[PDB]
């Protein structure tokens, strides 16, 4: 591209570094939901994968994103803290 | 106005301008009863004929108040099935305001609140009165009336795809999912949530939707 101006596409639903430290693989959904609340995306047909996915566009080049998923099992017990970065 | 006659002579002159199609003076003479004899027995039938006057006079919100009047006057009546049909039929004709219906810019990307109100009353006809002659028609209206909001919610799912808030795109497709499966636009939204997955790099979760795409390629 060559444009000098660019506003920023901005959405949260992230989880902080404090938010990861509250929880653990094994800590159940409710037990996570007391620490982290609900996600703004869960696995909508299968398991309880609580997606907390940050997405942000900081200008012309570069994209910032924190895709955190929380695959709890069917028992609610967490099986996966997938704190996946941008891209 | 209230041209006050005897109540039947009101009612006859209430009935005549309906047969003329002059609803404006039918309404004037149907008002001649319900202001002089609201204790009149066919004030209910006046309220039914007022909807036959108003809606055909393009006085659809005045029909809607006359719809709620016959509902408030008769919580029970075997002519509510006309009215509960006419209720959503008002609330679907509450939609049309301008000539975007010709241009393909028709109101299924627009304000749905009367249409969702029409979805209630059309179904409140078919559930409250399945015995009606009006029932399969409102059902046929209800067939459209999931799909008016489908392309409307697709227009939202269009927007957040343009916005690129792929967290939100999943949810608008999810609302497109959880309400209506029998809209192709939801299966047109089936790549779009799967799109939003891959833009958030949920390709395998998109692959789950690709299997749904592979299933709903049928």
């Amino acid at each position: 591209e060559r444009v000098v101006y660019r506003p920023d596409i901005n959405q949260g639903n992230y989880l902080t570094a404090n938010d990861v430290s509250k929880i653990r693989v094994g800590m159940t959904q409710q037990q996570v939901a007391y620490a982290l609340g609900t996600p703004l995306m869960s696995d909508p047909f299968g398991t309880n994968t609580w997606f907390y996915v940050f997405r942000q566009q900081p200008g012309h080049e570069g994209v910032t994103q924190q895709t955190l998923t929380l695959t709890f099992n069917s028992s609610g017990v967490l099986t996966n803290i997938d704190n996946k970065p941008a891209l | 106005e209230v041209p006050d006659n005897p109540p039947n002579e009101i009612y006859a002159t209430a009935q005549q301008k309906l047969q003329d199609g002059n609803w404006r003076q039918a309404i004037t003479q149907l008002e001649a009863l319900d202001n002089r004899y609201p204790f009149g027995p066919y004030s209910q039938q006046v309220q039914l004929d007022l909807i036959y006057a108003y809606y055909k006079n393009a006085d659809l919100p005045l029909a809607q108040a006359a719809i709620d009047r016959f509902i408030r006057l008769n919580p029970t009546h075997p002519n509510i099935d006309y009215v509960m049909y006419m209720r959503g039929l008002t609330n679907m004709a509450l939609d049309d305001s301008a000539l975007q219906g010709f241009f393909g810019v028709d109101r299924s990307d627009r304000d749905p609140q009367h249409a969702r109100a029409a979805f209630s009353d059309f179904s409140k006809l078919v559930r409250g009165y399945p015995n009606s002659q009006y029932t399969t028609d409102a059902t046929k209206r209800l067939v459209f009336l999931k799909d008016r909001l489908a392309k409307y919610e697709y227009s939202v799912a269009e927007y957040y795809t343009e916005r690129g808030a792929w967290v939100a795109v999943v949810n608008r497709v999810e609302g497109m999912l959880r309400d209506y499966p029998d809209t192709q636009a939801t299966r047109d939204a089936l790549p779009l949530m799967e799109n939003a997955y891959r833009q958030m790099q949920m390709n395998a979760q998109a692959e789950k939707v690709a299997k749904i795409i592979a299933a709903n390629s049928s």
Partner: protein
């Protein structure tokens, strides 16, 4: 005694059987003489039976009943300034209306509730009487008469316990005020008991900001004065011995923004107490935590009011909400506007923590949209999780369509017309469409102007503009000033800031002229064009296809697009020609819209508009005379006629236009004015200097049913347009413009009425300074 039947007569609302159930002498029941009298009270307890005469034919019942129902009408008389439905709302508070059961005992209770209204409205001095007018079958008219003496009115406010402030200067910061002199006219005044309670809290603020944290109003005593107009007020307060804001003890759920909160609580310790500031600094946290997601920033201050040194320390109890309350948002009130067109006019995105401003930031864009009537919402807090608020943007849109009027006389003569409709962002679907044009027996003009503002979602305003003016101006065929002008100017606007946005376009100016007028300033452009056509005739053609590059920049700092009130939008425009253009010229143009509230309640706001520009040739040429500047009458200057502001063209000693009408369309020809002939139409100048100052003005006899979207404004519209190429060489014999001293002037008032096709501004303005031949139409009506 047992009833065999009852005689049910005179009911008018109650049915026959519905009377029977209120009868204890009901058919089949045993009938006692008490049940006779119990039928008296219980049929009276229907509220609809005026007399109840329970008799029996031996024991065969008959209850002779006159009746309370239908009030067939309600009449009002003497309530000149009071709306009668307010009087009827007291009647509706009485449970009484047209077609109701009229008890003839509650007559004064109505007139109580009307006097109680008259009491509460600001009077007591009036009298009311419900006039029972009996009508057939039982019926009644409720005529109401109103003999209004006067409203009560404020006289004197005594405040005791005040010691550090004058009660007179207390009033000067109060709502309740008096005194319209002939030394400072402020307009007449009255009383309302609600202006007391605000002036209590006006005073409550008035001591709180100073330090007085022990300030308390003891009581107040409004004199119920033996005149029924005297409102003398005796307030008792306790002043409150000013406290020094000595520090803050802010804590609680600070959400990790504790220093950020502390930035808001940067106070001077020992400054005089301002709890109104302390109120705001809590909201500073609420904006801070709100934009940090916390839609519920429970912030509770507590002044540790230390009287021992007259200080206040400040406990502040903070509790943030959760961050990601923005789950999703909803949109409504968009039935003839696509949601995504409005949804892209929003900055808070779903799947995010709350930005407390981005809703209103988008709504300000939706205010700067302008094709709305109310931009508003429903911030629906969805319970279930504090990650859930689903903001239902229910707005009120505006009308569409905008027509511009102008006509000779048609449909009884040759069809000659000026039209044009503006779609006001067509179907609300991202297409700002405004179309104009005119076909007469004098021209054939077509034009389009359509902007897709989000053809590209960055903000690329797809502004396409084309035209074809076959302006022929028929004397008989083409003989006076014919020009077929046509071409293209497609334009694009891009985001440069959220306030800065530049403009760019490419102009194709293809004109096809014939029989050019003997007016001299036309020819000196032609002689700079290299043509030297015959001065004394109109036998002269001009076929030019100019190629211009267009440019500009808008500023964006102003409230609304529907009713803007504060700020300034500086919108540059300009054009230059390119290699390949049939004429080498340029033009810039400079206009302002500055919005300064002199009244910050915005019933009076400085509306600063100016007009500037200069353009000339781009080497070897001039700017064309049709590209020169104008004003006056049909312009921002009004009170004149069309184009009075600019240099004035003078015809060469002329012979023939190739046809001269029979002493009609006179152009210094052989057939009249066989000499130089001058015209007072402003032919135009290459420089513009026009300025008028408008001022918002409220409407006192206009209900706000329709006062809201309309506005009234006075002005002083003056100006100066001159041509630097208008010399004085042989123009010494003519009016001479080569300087910015050609000061025209009118002044008057404009009347913006917003029709169902939008605002159609009508006006009156009066010239008192006219410069070099101005034509005056003082009555000016515009759109």
């Amino acid at each position: 005694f047992v009833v065999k039947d009852i005689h049910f007569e005179g009911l008018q609302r109650v049915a026959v059987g519905a009377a029977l159930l209120s009868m204890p002498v009901r058919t089949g029941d045993t009938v006692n003489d008490e049940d006779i009298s119990n039928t008296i009270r219980a049929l009276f307890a229907t509220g609809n039976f005026e007399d109840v005469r329970v008799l029996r034919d031996g024991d065969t019942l008959l209850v002779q009943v006159k009746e309370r129902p239908t009030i067939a009408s309600i009449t009002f008389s003497g309530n000149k300034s009071v709306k009668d439905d307010m009087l009827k709302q007291n009647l509706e508070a009485s449970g009484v209306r047209v077609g109701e059961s009229l008890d003839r005992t509650t007559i004064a209770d109505i007139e109580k509730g009307l006097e109680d209204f008259y009491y509460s409205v600001g009077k007591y001095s009036a009298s009311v009487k419900a006039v029972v007018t009996p009508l057939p079958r039982n019926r009644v008219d409720l005529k109401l008469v109103f003999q209004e003496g006067v409203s009560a009115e404020i006289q004197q406010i005594n405040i005791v316990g005040n010691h550090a402030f004058t009660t007179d200067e207390l009033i000067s910061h109060f709502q309740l005020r008096d005194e319209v002199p002939w030394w400072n006219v402020v307009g007449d005044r009255k009383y309302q008991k609600q202006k007391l309670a605000g002036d209590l809290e006006t005073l409550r603020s008035y001591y709180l900001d100073r330090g007085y944290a022990r300030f308390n109003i003891d009581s107040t005593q409004v004199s119920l004065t033996p005149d029924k107009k005297g409102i003398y007020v005796t307030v008792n307060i306790t002043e409150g011995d000013q406290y020094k804001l000595s520090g803050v003890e802010v804590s609680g759920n600070l959400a990790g923004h504790s220093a950020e909160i502390e930035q808001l609580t940067k106070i001077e310790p020992g400054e005089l107490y301002n709890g109104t500031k302390v109120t705001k600094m809590e909201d500073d946290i609420k904006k801070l935590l709100g934009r940090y997601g916390y839609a519920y920033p429970r912030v509770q201050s507590m002044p540790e009011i230390n009287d021992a040194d007259k200080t206040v320390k400040l406990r502040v109890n903070v509790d943030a909400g959760n961050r990601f309350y923005v789950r999703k948002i909803r949109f409504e009130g968009n039935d003839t506007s696509k949601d995504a067109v409005l949804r892209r006019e929003m900055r808070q995105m779903e799947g995010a923590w709350l930005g407390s401003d981005l809703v209103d930031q988008g709504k300000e864009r939706l205010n700067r949209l302008g094709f709305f009537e109310t931009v508003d919402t429903d911030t629906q807090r969805v319970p279930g999780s504090p990650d859930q608020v689903d903001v239902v943007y229910k707005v009120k849109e505006r009308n569409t369509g905008s027509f511009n009027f102008g006509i000779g006389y048609g449909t009884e003569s040759g069809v000659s017309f000026q039209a044009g409709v503006q779609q006001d962002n067509w179907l609300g679907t991202g297409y700002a469409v405004g179309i104009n044009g005119t076909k007469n027996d004098y021209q054939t003009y077509a034009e389009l102007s359509v902007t897709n503002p989000y053809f590209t979602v960055d903000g690329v305003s797809l502004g396409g503009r084309l035209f074809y003016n076959d302006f022929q101006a028929d004397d008989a065929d083409l003989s006076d000033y014919t020009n077929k002008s046509y071409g293209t100017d497609v334009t694009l606007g891009f985001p440069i800031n959220e306030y800065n946005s530049l403009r760019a376009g490419l102009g194709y100016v293809h004109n096809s002229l014939s029989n050019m007028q003997p007016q001299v300033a036309m020819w000196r452009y032609l002689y700079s064009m290299g043509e030297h056509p015959s001065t004394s005739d109109q036998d002269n053609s001009f076929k030019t296809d100019d190629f211009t590059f267009n440019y500009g920049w808008t500023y964006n700092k102003l409230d609304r697009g529907y009713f803007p009130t504060d700020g300034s939008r500086v919108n540059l425009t300009g054009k230059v020609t390119i290699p390949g253009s049939d004429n080498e010229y340029y033009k810039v143009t400079l206009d302002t819209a500055t919005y300064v509230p002199i009244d910050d309640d915005h019933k009076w706001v400085v509306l600063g508009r100016t007009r500037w520009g200069y353009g000339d040739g781009l080497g070897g040429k001039e700017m064309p005379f049709y590209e020169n500047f104008y004003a006056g009458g049909s312009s921002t200057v009004r009170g004149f006629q069309s184009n009075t502001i600019g240099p004035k063209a003078v015809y060469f000693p002329h012979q023939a236009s190739n046809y001269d009408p029979d002493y009609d369309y006179e152009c210094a020809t052989q057939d009249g004015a066989k000499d130089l002939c001058k015209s007072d139409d402003a032919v135009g100048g290459n420089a513009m200097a026009v300025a008028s100052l408008e001022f918002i003005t409220p409407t006192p006899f206009i209900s706000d049913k329709y006062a809201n979207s309309v506005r009234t404004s006075f002005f002083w519209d003056m100006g100066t347009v001159w041509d630097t190429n208008w010399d004085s060489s042989q123009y010494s014999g003519y009016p001479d413009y080569s300087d910015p001293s050609n000061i025209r002037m009118s002044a008057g008032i404009a009347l913006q009425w917003m029709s169902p096709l939008g605002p159609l501004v009508f006006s009156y303005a009066q010239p008192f300074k006219k410069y070099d031949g101005d034509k005056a139409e003082q009555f000016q009506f515009n759109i």
